[PDB]
Amino acid sequence: MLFSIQTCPCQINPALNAVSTPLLYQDCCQPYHDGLYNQAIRADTAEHLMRTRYSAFVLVKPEYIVKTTLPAQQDLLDIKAIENWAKETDWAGLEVVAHTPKLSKRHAQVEFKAYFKTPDGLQAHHELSTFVKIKNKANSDASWYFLDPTVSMSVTQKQPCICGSGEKFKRCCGMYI
Ligand SMILES: [Cl-]
Ligand SMILES: [Zn+2]
Ligand SMILES: [Zn+2]
Fold first, then answer.
1. Domain boundaries, the chain
2. Which pairing describes strands 121-135 and 142-146: parallel, antiparallel, or unpaired?
3. Which CATH code of 2.60.120.650, 3.90.1150.10, 3.30.70.1350, 3.10.450.50 fits the domain covering 2-177?
4. What does the alpha-carbon distance between residue 24 and residue 7 come to, in Å, rounded to a whole number?
């Protein structure tokens, strides 16, 4: 509970000694985690979504990780396995290398390093993640969703994309996963 008043996990960056004080969890990712849990407050950009996901790994909020994954993939995730992996990894920070908000009409990328500690020392996962913007079936509002490249799927290439865009999978999310 008192993580609210400590540095937000996404604000811990071993690659930077900054002048500006890193934001507290309550002032950074917590509104987004709490929002999705109770509800609509949503990440405005793919970079912001990626940060909130990282903080959900560190703080062990696997529900948030599932619900911010492309809806068509969510039933393919194993929330218990996510929960365990999140808990057992000794997270040590986040460095956002680059944000590509206009990768396509409906996609964005975020390149980042997620740091962790091992017997051997400080290590990093260097990742390039892809996100898709999907409209609510509710109002003209849209949200960003993570395209999980690790889940096994048997998708038909010429059929409509799993994101619901109406574009062929191969001319849409299949370009990137
Ligand atoms: Cl499938
Ligand atoms: Zn944060
Ligand atoms: Zn798509």
1. 2-177
2. antiparallel
3. 3.10.450.50
4. 4
CA 25 / ligand 3 centre spacing (Å) = 32
CA of 96 to the centre of ligand 2 (A): 12
Does residue 10 have a known ligand-binding role? yes
- Determine the distance from the C-alpha atom of residue 25 to the mean position of all C-alpha atoms in its chain, rounded to a whole number: 16
Q: Under a CB-based contact definition with an 8 Å cutoff, are residues 53 and 68 in contact? A: yes
Experimental technique: X-ray
Is 12 a known ligand-binding residue?
no
Assign 3-state DSSP to the chain and report helix, strand, coil percentages, each to 5. Answer: 35, 25, 40
Give me the resolution in angstroms, 1 decimal.
1.8
171 is in an annotated binding site: no
Length reported for the chain: 177
H helices of 13-113, in order, are 30-38, 46-59, 62-67, 71-74, 79-88
Does 173 count as an annotated binding residue? yes
